[PDB]
Amino acid sequence: AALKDQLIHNLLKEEHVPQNKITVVGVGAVGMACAISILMKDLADELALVDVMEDKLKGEMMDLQHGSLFLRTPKIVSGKDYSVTANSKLVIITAGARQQEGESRLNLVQRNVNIFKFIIPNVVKYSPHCKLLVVSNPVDILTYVAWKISGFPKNRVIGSGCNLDSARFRYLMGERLGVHALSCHGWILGEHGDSSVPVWSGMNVAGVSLKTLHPELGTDADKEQWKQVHKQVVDSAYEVIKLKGYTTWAIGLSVADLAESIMKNLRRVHPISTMLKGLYGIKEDVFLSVPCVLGQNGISDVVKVTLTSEEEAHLKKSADTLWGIQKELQF
Amino acid sequence: AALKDQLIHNLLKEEHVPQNKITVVGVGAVGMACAISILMKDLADELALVDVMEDKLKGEMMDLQHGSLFLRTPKIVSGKDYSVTANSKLVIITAGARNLVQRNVNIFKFIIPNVVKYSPHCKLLVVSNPVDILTYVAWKISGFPKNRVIGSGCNLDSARFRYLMGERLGVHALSCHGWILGEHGDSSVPVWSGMNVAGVSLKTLHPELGTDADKEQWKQVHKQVVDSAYEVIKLKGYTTWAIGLSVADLAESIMKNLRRVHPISTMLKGLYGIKEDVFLSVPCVLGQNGISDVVKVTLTSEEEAHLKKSADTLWGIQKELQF
Amino acid sequence: AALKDQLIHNLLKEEHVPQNKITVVGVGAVGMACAISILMKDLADELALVDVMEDKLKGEMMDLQHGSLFLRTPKIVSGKDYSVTANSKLVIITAGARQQEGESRLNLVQRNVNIFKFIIPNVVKYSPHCKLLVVSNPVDILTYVAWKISGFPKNRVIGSGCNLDSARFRYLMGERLGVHALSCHGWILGEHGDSSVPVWSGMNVAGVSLKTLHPELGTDADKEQWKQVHKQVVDSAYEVIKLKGYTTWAIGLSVADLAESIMKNLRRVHPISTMLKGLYGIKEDVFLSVPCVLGQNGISDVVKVTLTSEEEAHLKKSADTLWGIQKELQF
Amino acid sequence: AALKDQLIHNLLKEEHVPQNKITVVGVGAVGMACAISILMKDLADELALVDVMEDKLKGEMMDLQHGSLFLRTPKIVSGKDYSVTANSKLVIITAGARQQEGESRLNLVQRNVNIFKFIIPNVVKYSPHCKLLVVSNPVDILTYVAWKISGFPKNRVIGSGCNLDSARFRYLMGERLGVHALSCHGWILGEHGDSSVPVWSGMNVAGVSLKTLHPELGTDADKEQWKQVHKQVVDSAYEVIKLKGYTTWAIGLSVADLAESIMKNLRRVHPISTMLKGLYGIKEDVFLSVPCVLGQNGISDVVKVTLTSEEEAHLKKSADTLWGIQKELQF
Numbered sequence A, C, D: 001a002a003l004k005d006q007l008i009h010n011l012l013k014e015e016h017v018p019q020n021k022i023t024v025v026g027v028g029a030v031g032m033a034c035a036i037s038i039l040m041k042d043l044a045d046e047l048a049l050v051d052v053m054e055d056k057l058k059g060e061m062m063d064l065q066h067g068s069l070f071l072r073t074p075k076i077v078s079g080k081d082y083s084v085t086a087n088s089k090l091v092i093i094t095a096g097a098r099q100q101e102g103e104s105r106l107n108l109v110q111r112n113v114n115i116f117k118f119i120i121p122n123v124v125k126y127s128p129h130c131k132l133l134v135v136s137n138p139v140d141i142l143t144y145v146a147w148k149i150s151g152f153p154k155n156r157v158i159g160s161g162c163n164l165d166s167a168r169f170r171y172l173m174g175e176r177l178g179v180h181a182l183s184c185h186g187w188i189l190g191e192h193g194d195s196s197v198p199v200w201s202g203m204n205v206a207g208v209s210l211k212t213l214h215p216e217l218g219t220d221a222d223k224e225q226w227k228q229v230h231k232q233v234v235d236s237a238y239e240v241i242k243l244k245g246y247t248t249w250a251i252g253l254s255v256a257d258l259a260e261s262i263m264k265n266l267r268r269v270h271p272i273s274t275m276l277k278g279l280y281g282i283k284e285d286v287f288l289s290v291p292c293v294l295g296q297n298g299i300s301d302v303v304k305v306t307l308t309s310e311e312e313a314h315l316k317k318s319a320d321t322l323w324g325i326q327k328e329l330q331f
Numbered sequence B: 001a002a003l004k005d006q007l008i009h010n011l012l013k014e015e016h017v018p019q020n021k022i023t024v025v026g027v028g029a030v031g032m033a034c035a036i037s038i039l040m041k042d043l044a045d046e047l048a049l050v051d052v053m054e055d056k057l058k059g060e061m062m063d064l065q066h067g068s069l070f071l072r073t074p075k076i077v078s079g080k081d082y083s084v085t086a087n088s089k090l091v092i093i094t095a096g097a098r099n100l101v102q103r104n105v106n107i108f109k110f111i112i113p114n115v116v117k118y119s120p121h122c123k124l125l126v127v128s129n130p131v132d133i134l135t136y137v138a139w140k141i142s143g144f145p146k147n148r149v150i151g152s153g154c155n156l157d158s159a160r161f162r163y164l165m166g167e168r169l170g171v172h173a174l175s176c177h178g179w180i181l182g183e184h185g186d187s188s189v190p191v192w193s194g195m196n197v198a199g200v201s202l203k204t205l206h207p208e209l210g211t212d213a214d215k216e217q218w219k220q221v222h223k224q225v226v227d228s229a230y231e232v233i234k235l236k237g238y239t240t241w242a243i244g245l246s247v248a249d250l251a252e253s254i255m256k257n258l259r260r261v262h263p264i265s266t267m268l269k270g271l272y273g274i275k276e277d278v279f280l281s282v283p284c285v286l287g288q289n290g291i292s293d294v295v296k297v298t299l300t301s302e303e304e305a306h307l308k309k310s311a312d313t314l315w316g317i318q319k320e321l322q323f
């Protein structure tokens, strides 16, 4: 008698189980950028959102849903309780607390750990086999904490690390050179942020080494000052926060790119943070960005970049600072 | 020589004239949502963003540029000076003021002649509320022929409706068809007679459809479409995602000359019993020249009178305003 | 040390299992158009091809493989042995014999059945849970046949049926009208071919009944002879064949469209062929095109279109004729 | 009143002229693969096909047309008469005469010169400002021919050159290394064919030079025999033809990638053949593959690769033999 039943004859009981499902944890400006980039790239057949801010949660979920005519991701859900995230191939974490002044690095990072003590177990319970991608800062350390708290093998716990910074360094590289970033190549590795290492030996267009053309590249004797480009990169995020109150669009597109490799098993290489104990001369349990082959199983391989000894030195110094810090956290 | 010069030999001295450029005026939640959707559908070779808050503007430009590696739109610019909108094929107006209209009219009195001076041949796509009026304002102030001035109108609301249709029937909104026309807002018309799946008229299956006696209360569905913007602002302060997607849908049809039919707001004098310079939503054919054709929807006599009611309502408001 | 091992440190042992695998059976021109349309729409993470022409089979593979820089489907495999199609989500059947002179159509039909008898049981073996999509002609019969041989439930066995006819119908509609096919709605239902049913009562633009606007629509006394539009649809595969010698592109795009709804669980409605014993006044075991909600479990519901009386008789007549062919067959 | 009139009210009585029109010359397998690849990448608002095979020409057009529901390219046209190609932004030449013997190079080539003598003038007549993209073999020679006949300036005449070959190389690379070709980088430059120059020096993953890791790379003493990878690239067109009768898909995909940089002004760098007199030591009017910046004005800049003295002389030899051939042609 109903309209649905008058119009439509049903022939198949539900058994609805998601196939390529993604969850974004945290619907702050970063998460929703991740959400929208992912939805517009068609990477999932179900997206789940989670956060503690129930009102903002339902609202974002509703806005995205009203866009369905324009999407090809048939189901969007959200909630306080993590069972809406059940059976994710990928779980992306952007949840954070924002630092007070005085607070101090250490206490800030311990509150975030406090968030992962609640957030990580819940994800793991409902998606034992998901890959985790952390974006929260500080990224290298909070990723380590996800690895520790989830009990996941290191290949399934990925840190967004220096993915966007590299993209960045390539856009600026392209601005100076006059070609598209897609065709500008360069890697920023190691610890995310100002302590990141710009591998000047690797930078090229068309396989043409720029440090060979221009031996002063990056060094302090450089008439063209290419180290300031790295600087621009490292500073560009605060600079944007300074100008619009936060950043979103780039980090989201950056995450969508990672998500695509994962969800499509592309085995592309990205500068993202992984557990590198053993490699690049690192002996502590620390996550850093190195070129990783990324796919349906997370990080499967690492490209061994030939670093100078000063670069090898840089990373080795981040491992210590990191570990020092992680050593002082309460799990 | 300089490293760029060691690396690259110039052979052509480059006449940079955008061929598929798009401008979004206003970088609030709405306009940015429009920008990010447009970038991601690969619709423009150039995007320009104009506003009046210069930091906010500069920082949105920078945030979008940083993602260039992941985009296929090679140039993104911004600034308070409208020289940056030069040569746009399409200019999207999301600017608006926190009675108002005359205030919004005042804003448009500044923005629109600027847009017209730098892109004489662009199409205007008004999104800011109150949208049927602001679209009339832009058209009047612009000097443009009417096909080149579009209101976003009932497009999104028709998207919401189909979404909700598809929740009650269990098929994707893509396969649920239903039109909302007229004044964008509480006084819009749910055209019951055209709601169908696979060409199967719901109203014929269920004549009570949309009536108060409707045991299924499909009338609530139109009310829910008319309330949802307000409901969503209530939850998260504003709305964005769905409006941006629907604007990019319109962008798409224009920049590829698809000639798709959308429920958008056009200067409909001479149609539907209407005799005023008003913009109302009707099924428009939409392409490289903006609105070029309108579908003449067959209406019940009440629906016909509801449209006339909104023409005179809109006209009455405009008669105050000064340009 | 091999260059590989020198460049890349392996951290995982992989046991590759494909997550969104699609197979196309038959690398004729229809199958290869399906193939390219799917690879360009990013619907699968692995694509496998099979045929009996082992050389044609290896050339198509390589040729696709060579386009990998431009694709996002990491893995493309091919072979005469169906081992290569294992664990497919969706298997598309474009295999078929072409006639002699000479032989009867009934006997050309049997010959195709003897191909399916060999092909279907092999697909089932390596992809028990796959959805079957049959494209080969005559499609309503061969879909039934794939159904009976497979022993699959009816939801998981889909005939491409009238989905292209309807797209053409809509394209030709928008030519007459000056609107894009996306915005013309009209349905071709029933049997694929000369006896299919243009449902005139449902033709519209923006929900405006052309029928109500013009009561002659589809009538013999129609000054505008819209009927001839149906005729063009029925004849268009033919007209195309006289001209270029086969059709490919259009059927290929339309197959990918059906593939996108399945792989993404969109639950859109398509004019496709399904086992409709029980509905539409059909008392026989035959496949006919009706509007079907199509998703990750194939056809889950169908929309019941109010047919005029002249129209029910067409479908019941088509069902009688099909059944009677189906009885003259050897499984 | 006509149904279309009852239904639609015309407001704009407007005109024609397309904004992003692309033409494909030649509806052989290569040009059609170019057609479908372009249509699924949403690169055009109008696509025109032209060829002398009138039936085949109209057949392909109609087959593409029937897929309009699924495309976002509103207008597809075809014709023996080049008025159909009017106002293209890009014109892709894939025409050619087929072998038989007595290919006194300067003869089977001479018959393609003569095909160009008819086609190019017709292209230039109706698309005065278009970009010319030549794919026909022999490509570097036929691109020069197109250049001389059209009278276009060098930036607007483009040969597909080694764009596809480098992509295959990158593909074979990713097979040896176990990453996607997207992440492997290397350049094949110079004369498209056996005499093309694999630039070993520039091969790399994530900026890490392979020839540095492994100095035998590309030499005979290479126990890994990476020299056979360049040779397998040179040969793969042949192998494929040997298997399937011709090659389509990869040349179609790569050409659509060039199309993309042009139509979007991306200024990406592609290994394509440009008129390079004055660069790379070459003093004759010839076309070679070097890294080119490709945008809305064609080839605007050229990346100067650092070459060995062997590579350089090798490029010179290709330049002098191309020229030797070009002198022997009749315009």
Ligand SMILES: COc1ccc(Cl)cc1NC(=O)CSc1ccc(C(=O)O)cn1
Pocket (backbone or CB within 6 Å): A025, A026, A027, A050, A051, A052, A094, A095, A096, A097, A098, A111, A112, A114, A115, A118, A119
């Ligand atoms: C700021 O907290 C969150 C942000 C995003 C998401 Cl998705 C979830 C959360 N919060 C939680 O998941 C609850 S656990 C917790 C622990 C400490 C603090 C604090 O120091 O403020 C907040 N929550």
Ligand SMILES: COc1ccc(Cl)cc1NC(=O)CSc1ccc(C(=O)O)cn1
Pocket (backbone or CB within 6 Å): B025, B026, B027, B050, B051, B052, B094, B095, B096, B097, B098, B103, B104, B106, B107, B110, B111
């Ligand atoms: C609210 O003003 C704007 C917002 C977004 C954009 Cl893109 C441009 C603007 N505003 C302008 O372009 C300057 S003209 C003007 C007139 C009145 C008011 C007012 O009522 O406060 C504001 N501006």
Ligand SMILES: COc1ccc(Cl)cc1NC(=O)CSc1ccc(C(=O)O)cn1
Pocket (backbone or CB within 6 Å): C025, C026, C027, C050, C051, C052, C094, C095, C096, C097, C098, C111, C112, C114, C115, C118, C119
């Ligand atoms: C025409 O045969 C095929 C076409 C495409 C594919 Cl993928 C597979 C095939 N054929 C087979 O898989 C072998 S079984 C068979 C049965 C009858 C005939 C006949 O009547 O000529 C041919 N083969």
Ligand SMILES: COc1ccc(Cl)cc1NC(=O)CSc1ccc(C(=O)O)cn1
Pocket (backbone or CB within 6 Å): D025, D026, D027, D050, D051, D052, D094, D095, D096, D097, D111, D112, D114, D115, D118, D119
């Ligand atoms: C076969 O030639 C063509 C192939 C594709 C296209 Cl689009 C156009 C053509 N051909 C033409 O444009 C006609 S001119 C000509 C000159 C020489 C020969 C010959 O030596 O066989 C053939 N035609």
